[PDB]
Amino acid sequence: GFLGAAGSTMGAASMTLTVQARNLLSGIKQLQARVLAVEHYLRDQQLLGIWGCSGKLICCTNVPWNSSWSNRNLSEIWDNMTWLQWDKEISNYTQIIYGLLEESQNQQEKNEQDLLALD
Amino acid sequence: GFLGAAGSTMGAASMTLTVQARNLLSGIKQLQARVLAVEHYLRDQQLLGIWGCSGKLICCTNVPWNSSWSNRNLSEIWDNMTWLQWDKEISNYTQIIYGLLEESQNQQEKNEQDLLALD
Amino acid sequence: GFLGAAGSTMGAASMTLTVQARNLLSGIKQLQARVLAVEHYLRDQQLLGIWGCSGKLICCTNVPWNSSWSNRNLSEIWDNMTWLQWDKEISNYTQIIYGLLEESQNQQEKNEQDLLALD
Amino acid sequence: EVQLVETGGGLVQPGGSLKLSCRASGYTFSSFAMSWVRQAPGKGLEWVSLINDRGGLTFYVDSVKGRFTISRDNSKNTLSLQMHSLRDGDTAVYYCATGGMSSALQSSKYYFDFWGQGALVTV
Amino acid sequence: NLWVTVYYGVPVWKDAETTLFCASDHNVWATHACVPTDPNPQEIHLENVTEEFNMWKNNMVEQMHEDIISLWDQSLKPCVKLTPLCVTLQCTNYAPKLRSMMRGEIKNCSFNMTTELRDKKQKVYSLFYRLDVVQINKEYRLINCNTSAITQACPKVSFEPIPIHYCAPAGFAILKCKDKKFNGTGPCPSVSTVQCTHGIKPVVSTQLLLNGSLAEEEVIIRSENITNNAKNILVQLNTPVQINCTRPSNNTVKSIRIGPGQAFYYFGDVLGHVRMAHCNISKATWNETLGKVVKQLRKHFGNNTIIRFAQSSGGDLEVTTHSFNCGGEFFYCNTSGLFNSTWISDSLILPCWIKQIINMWQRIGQAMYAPPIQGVIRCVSNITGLILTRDSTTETFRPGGGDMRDNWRSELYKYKVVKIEPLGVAPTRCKRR
Amino acid sequence: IRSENITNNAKNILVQLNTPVQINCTRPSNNTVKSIRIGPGQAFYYFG
Amino acid sequence: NPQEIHLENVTEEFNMWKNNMVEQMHEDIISLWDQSLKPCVKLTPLCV
Ligand SMILES: *[C@@H]1O[C@H](CO)[C@@H](O[C@@H]2O[C@H](CO)[C@@H](O)[C@H](O)[C@H]2NC(C)=O)[C@H](O)[C@H]1NC(C)=O
Ligand SMILES: *[C@@H]1O[C@H](CO)[C@@H](O[C@@H]2O[C@H](CO)[C@@H](O)[C@H](O)[C@H]2NC(C)=O)[C@H](O)[C@H]1NC(C)=O
Ligand SMILES: *[C@@H]1O[C@H](CO)[C@@H](O[C@@H]2O[C@H](CO)[C@@H](O)[C@H](O)[C@H]2NC(C)=O)[C@H](O)[C@H]1NC(C)=O
Ligand SMILES: *[C@@H]1O[C@H](CO)[C@@H](O[C@@H]2O[C@H](CO)[C@@H](O)[C@H](O)[C@H]2NC(C)=O)[C@H](O)[C@H]1NC(C)=O
Ligand SMILES: *[C@@H]1O[C@H](CO)[C@@H](O)[C@H](O)[C@H]1NC(C)=O
Ligand SMILES: *[C@@H]1O[C@H](CO)[C@@H](O)[C@H](O)[C@H]1NC(C)=O
Ligand SMILES: *[C@@H]1O[C@H](CO)[C@@H](O)[C@H](O)[C@H]1NC(C)=O
Ligand SMILES: *[C@@H]1O[C@H](CO)[C@@H](O)[C@H](O)[C@H]1NC(C)=O
Ligand SMILES: *[C@@H]1O[C@H](CO)[C@@H](O)[C@H](O)[C@H]1NC(C)=O
Ligand SMILES: *[C@@H]1O[C@H](CO)[C@@H](O)[C@H](O)[C@H]1NC(C)=O
Ligand SMILES: *[C@@H]1O[C@H](CO)[C@@H](O)[C@H](O)[C@H]1NC(C)=O
Ligand SMILES: *[C@@H]1O[C@H](CO)[C@@H](O)[C@H](O)[C@H]1NC(C)=O
Ligand SMILES: *[C@@H]1O[C@H](CO)[C@@H](O)[C@H](O)[C@H]1NC(C)=O
Ligand SMILES: *[C@@H]1O[C@H](CO)[C@@H](O)[C@H](O)[C@H]1NC(C)=O
Ligand SMILES: *[C@@H]1O[C@H](CO)[C@@H](O)[C@H](O)[C@H]1NC(C)=O
Ligand SMILES: *[C@@H]1O[C@H](CO)[C@@H](O)[C@H](O)[C@H]1NC(C)=O
Ligand SMILES: *[C@@H]1O[C@H](CO)[C@@H](O)[C@H](O)[C@H]1NC(C)=O
Ligand SMILES: *[C@@H]1O[C@H](CO)[C@@H](O)[C@H](O)[C@H]1NC(C)=O
Ligand SMILES: *[C@@H]1O[C@H](CO)[C@@H](O)[C@H](O)[C@H]1NC(C)=O
Ligand SMILES: *[C@@H]1O[C@H](CO)[C@@H](O)[C@H](O)[C@H]1NC(C)=O
Ligand SMILES: *[C@@H]1O[C@H](CO)[C@@H](O)[C@H](O)[C@H]1NC(C)=O
Ligand SMILES: *[C@@H]1O[C@H](CO)[C@@H](O)[C@H](O)[C@H]1NC(C)=O
Ligand SMILES: *[C@@H]1O[C@H](CO)[C@@H](O)[C@H](O)[C@H]1NC(C)=O
Ligand SMILES: *[C@@H]1O[C@H](CO)[C@@H](O)[C@H](O)[C@H]1NC(C)=O
Ligand SMILES: *[C@@H]1O[C@H](CO)[C@@H](O)[C@H](O)[C@H]1NC(C)=O
Ligand SMILES: *[C@@H]1O[C@H](CO)[C@@H](O)[C@H](O)[C@H]1NC(C)=O
Ligand SMILES: *[C@@H]1O[C@H](CO)[C@@H](O)[C@H](O)[C@H]1NC(C)=O
Ligand SMILES: *[C@@H]1O[C@H](CO)[C@@H](O)[C@H](O)[C@H]1NC(C)=O
Ligand SMILES: *[C@@H]1O[C@H](CO)[C@@H](O)[C@H](O)[C@H]1NC(C)=O
């Protein structure tokens, strides 16, 4: 169900992303609400685009983990914490992570162009 | 031309998908109509996304054909049927196929993540 | 900055595509303006999709340059000309390139489907 | 005019390591791709490694892929080569050179346009 | 050996006309469909970029016009419509025993007002300005009676202009010429991209441009065709001239009920002396400013050509006089002494009349009644430009005026709206697998 | 001949012809027109 | 048919006095009231 995994651990919750994603699209003020929802959806799709993640729900990238953002171990993060707790844990670093992802994808695309140029 | 292949066989009609794709996008009720057209377009694009087909008109998956949905051979389906007749013959199965496609993409994404995890 | 590289050479300006991509998504007439902006964005994304570029910002294709569109050498184009001048220079050829890109992608997708069909 | 000068260490032993460094002048360093090549007294010219203009991409001959690293510092206009094991068959005069590759916004090169003086690596 | 590479995010734009957003950090100029301005608006200079501007083809002015008309109509709808006011007026002179030049301008009229109950009438006495009352042919009627019903503006709504910032919708951008001595048309080599314009005060005036922008260096004369006498000439000053305007007479406002919850306000007894409203401009400042305007005219028309100024005495009073909103009250100032010089190779008093019934934007059929304002009114405004029109050995021209779009154009002359085209192609040495 | 149900007398029959029939209709009288003002900005027009 | 799902191990903080649904409820109800009574008889002749 929608948000059914919200209280589950991050690992278990990672298996329910499809239902939550599919329910994101589902006088003047309601039309404004529909337009705003579309704009937010497209903002998320464009953010995935500039990172090279537009084609999938789970997209691995080439940006390493800083460890200053959070020093919890992998097992702790995925098996003990919930996604709300994780969001709080790194709420101060989102604008840095997104910028690094943007730079990484830009370098990846330029590298692909240079590799394709080889005869 | 737009829908020119509607009466053509499925095989020949598969070569005209570009025209319909471009023709899906081309006073309060006029704005409402445009918003609804956008919502339907985005629902279809998200549905292709969850299937891993966001960038293609034709994409293959790993989901097998049940054969109970339709026991016609490929020659009969592609040469002796129109898309309208095919759509009618599987009208009771479409949502089952959609569910299987979503599960297949979820398994592919998790398997891809695990393969990428190997050094 | 938005359009900060607009006066830069095409080569230098190619490194700021993500600034434009991010910024382009930043009483009834105002809602109409927002909906039209969304429709233009979606038409551009659909146009990239039909070409098979998915979410890539720099998309390399299989369509050769004819040289009748512009006979400048690569170095002159990228180092001694801006995007405004270049876009004006080839304004009469844009729809031909777009048609060639759509045909090339349709052939590529059919070839990929046939390759996948091989056991 | 354009100058390119190889520097680095001299005598090495098998199993060790050696860093070579090339200083460039007379042109924009970051505008050209570069490579490392070697000339042994008993051999002809051979290519060892290739680096792009940015430095993101590196290529090596199969015989050194597991030991050699090519890198560049664009702000210092300096090309570096880190070598390991330094086998007897690796004794040669090493050179760095400009050219050999292009960004795909500049015309095709695939040639070594400017060669340095060279430095002798003796095992 | 080259292939087509498709780029998304190309900094290329094309000319386009679209809807602009209102931004502003009750007042009739405050649009409800308007958001706060950016706390830190960005201005990004475009180096090595030249853009062709044309103030006479700028579609931002038409949007500002439509926005102001819509805003005022929406603001006046929820106000009392003065339908019972068009009645026979028994009028005399308020203060005939005066020696000032104001005598005879104010009429003391008596009428009936319908009270609140339909079966009762209330005899009422009030004062009106001469220019608002016409004899029926003593018996007088309101000037608007043969045009339309007149709506009373809500007195709680201020008319003081609020700077309005125009912001591009997503997908579009605003370019600023940002070029000293730009004449309104042609290439601008100093183009800067702004998300929103600076605040434009929606000041309503004729002949003189008030509370506007100044020229960066010198006086700038802008015209669609400088040699076409039929085109309006907009002169932007680089040295603001202060104008001291006042309605020195005192006032009180009476209030009666005319319907079920509909109150009507009217001018009452004048306290102290009865004196005519007027404006003050120092003579030396005007002489020097006008000399600068003449120097620009010499640049355009020749050094030895005789230049003559004259008043636009013909036409409607709303055009022949200066229309000035002083403290919320509408002044109609003669100001003929400002355009009386001839040029070859202590202070001035500008009489003003007061009107309570006005017709804005030359829209015949939509009269508006201005409420009276208590007390004595004094204001100081900046003259930042002039409007001139022209009718050879001698070149004679007049202030002209009478079209609000030019005033907004005067402020918006330096902005253009363009659509962003993120897609483009270029040859590269690459090929898709 | 079009109908929802050609034998149901509660519905209309819509007949589309295969030939036009020209019809010339007129008001032959030469009528006077007058106009008056009835209120501020309001006017009534009437047959004279 | 309603659709709801219980969230186990979720401890959300609520504040009924900061909820913007109350303002929408109020605005919508007054809007419905005012709009529904527009096409009705205004009793001007009763103020006599
Ligand atoms: C415009 O200038 C005249 C001077 O010609 C001002 O008139 C004086 O106003 C003061 C105000 O207290 C009086 O005390 C003087 O007796 C007036 N003198 C004359 C000769 O009129 C007038 O007030 C000025 N108006 C403005 C708005 O500045
Ligand atoms: C307008 O004129 C009327 C009469 O023409 C004024 O009414 C009279 O004013 C005098 C002033 O002392 C009184 O003594 C009378 O009793 C008034 N008569 C009535 C019937 O009211 C009226 O005051 C004038 N209006 C103004 C503003 O001066
Ligand atoms: C031009 O700007 C001046 C300065 O704000 C305006 O004058 C002020 O108007 C307000 C309105 O209530 C008064 O409270 C101030 O005391 C006035 N100050 C001065 C120095 O006059 C003036 O009204 C503006 N002009 C127009 C046409 O809007
Ligand atoms: C319809 O037909 C009648 C006669 O069939 C027309 O009537 C004639 O109109 C003319 C017009 O000047 C007269 O001079 C004749 O005397 C009329 N004759 C009769 C018998 O009425 C009538 O005008 C026709 N109307 C139209 C619209 O065609
Ligand atoms: C809540 O915690 C309990 C503890 O074991 C767990 O069994 C349950 O599945 C958790 N809830 C969810 C939605 O995962
Ligand atoms: C971790 O973040 C800090 C932030 O100041 C940065 O200095 C450091 O280099 C980062 N480390 C890595 C490995 O990214
Ligand atoms: C990971 O963090 C949890 C948090 O309590 C801790 O119990 C666990 O031992 C940690 N594991 C490692 C390997 O650090
Ligand atoms: C975020 O920063 C604020 C101070 O700026 C600090 O109080 C808060 O604890 C930080 N939160 C996290 C998750 O780092
Ligand atoms: C229509 O049917 C005829 C039958 O002979 C066939 O030749 C033709 O190709 C068909 N066309 C389409 C579009 O189905
Ligand atoms: C085909 O559909 C039937 C329907 O019940 C199902 O029982 C059967 O398992 C399906 N077979 C395959 C291979 O999907
Ligand atoms: C397909 O099936 C039909 C009957 O369902 C049969 O007549 C036809 O020959 C079959 N074709 C092939 C290629 O199996
Ligand atoms: C779908 O189910 C309905 C249920 O009555 C049936 O009438 C129809 O023929 C079915 N269609 C298919 C293709 O199974
Ligand atoms: C503009 O031209 C000057 C001329 O040399 C150059 O130095 C500068 O880098 C250029 N800037 C851009 C953004 O093109
Ligand atoms: C290149 O341009 C010429 C000009 O007529 C045209 O004939 C030719 O077909 C074009 N080739 C391609 C591949 O577009
Ligand atoms: C590009 O063409 C111009 C045209 O004269 C020429 O001067 C220039 O040298 C050419 N550059 C290359 C790299 O071919
Ligand atoms: C494009 O067409 C216009 C006329 O429509 C012509 O003036 C211009 O030179 C053409 N440009 C090219 C590159 O063909
Ligand atoms: C008020 O109405 C009466 C008639 O009831 C009329 O005689 C009188 O003149 C009116 N008052 C004025 C000032 O005209
Ligand atoms: C009455 O209306 C006419 C035009 O219909 C206008 O010219 C005239 O001035 C109006 N009367 C007054 C007193 O303004
Ligand atoms: C503005 O300056 C340009 C400069 O070439 C000139 O061509 C144009 O006529 C001028 N226009 C006016 C109104 O001064
Ligand atoms: C501008 O004015 C001059 C003055 O005679 C005239 O000759 C010219 O045709 C006018 N041009 C336009 C475009 O109005
Ligand atoms: C306008 O009035 C202000 C108010 O003090 C005064 O300081 C200023 O000098 C006056 N200017 C003129 C030109 O009268
Ligand atoms: C100021 O007035 C005098 C007349 O006494 C005139 O000669 C002078 O030119 C005027 N100032 C300017 C700048 O023209
Ligand atoms: C006016 O003087 C300027 C020099 O300031 C000169 O260039 C111009 O030709 C003169 N014009 C006439 C008509 O004398
Ligand atoms: C201004 O006053 C003069 C004084 O004679 C008069 O002739 C002129 O018509 C007046 N102008 C206006 C617009 O009232
Ligand atoms: C214009 O100036 C002359 C003197 O130069 C004067 O006699 C005349 O009355 C003035 N007219 C106006 C309207 O100021
Ligand atoms: C103007 O009239 C008001 C009436 O309330 C009074 O309070 C004020 O003192 C008067 N001022 C002058 C200068 O007469
Ligand atoms: C007039 O311009 C000056 C320029 O500094 C400014 O300080 C003053 O506030 C302005 N006054 C008005 C009323 O616009
Ligand atoms: C219309 O024509 C079709 C032709 O087969 C017929 O079956 C149908 O009953 C007709 N309906 C009416 C209402 O005439
Ligand atoms: C059509 O009308 C006839 C007339 O009696 C009736 O018997 C028949 O049931 C009707 N059918 C429909 C579908 O309305």
Tab-separated table of N, CA and C and ligand atoms in Angstrom, chain A residues 88-93, ligand 8:
chain	number	residue	atom	x	y	z
A	88	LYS	N	16.092	13.019	8.265
A	88	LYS	CA	16.523	13.962	9.290
A	88	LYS	C	18.038	13.924	9.453
A	89	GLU	N	18.615	12.721	9.406
A	89	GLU	CA	20.045	12.533	9.634
A	89	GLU	C	20.905	13.352	8.675
A	90	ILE	N	20.500	13.461	7.405
A	90	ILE	CA	21.282	14.164	6.391
A	90	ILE	C	20.538	15.362	5.796
A	91	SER	N	19.581	15.939	6.526
A	91	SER	CA	18.810	17.053	5.976
A	91	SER	C	19.683	18.265	5.654
A	92	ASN	N	20.820	18.418	6.332
A	92	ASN	CA	21.709	19.557	6.125
A	92	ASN	C	22.680	19.398	4.960
A	93	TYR	N	22.696	18.255	4.272
A	93	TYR	CA	23.695	17.976	3.245
A	93	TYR	C	23.112	17.781	1.853
H	8	LIG	C1	21.736	21.197	10.810
H	8	LIG	O1	22.351	22.444	11.184
H	8	LIG	C2	21.815	23.026	12.383
H	8	LIG	C3	22.530	24.341	12.581
H	8	LIG	O2	22.703	25.028	11.349
H	8	LIG	C4	22.005	22.062	13.551
H	8	LIG	O3	21.430	22.624	14.725
H	8	LIG	C5	21.334	20.736	13.223
H	8	LIG	O4	21.553	19.804	14.274
H	8	LIG	C6	21.917	20.182	11.933
H	8	LIG	N1	21.288	18.916	11.596
H	8	LIG	C7	21.938	17.904	11.011
H	8	LIG	C8	21.126	16.674	10.741
H	8	LIG	O5	23.125	17.979	10.711
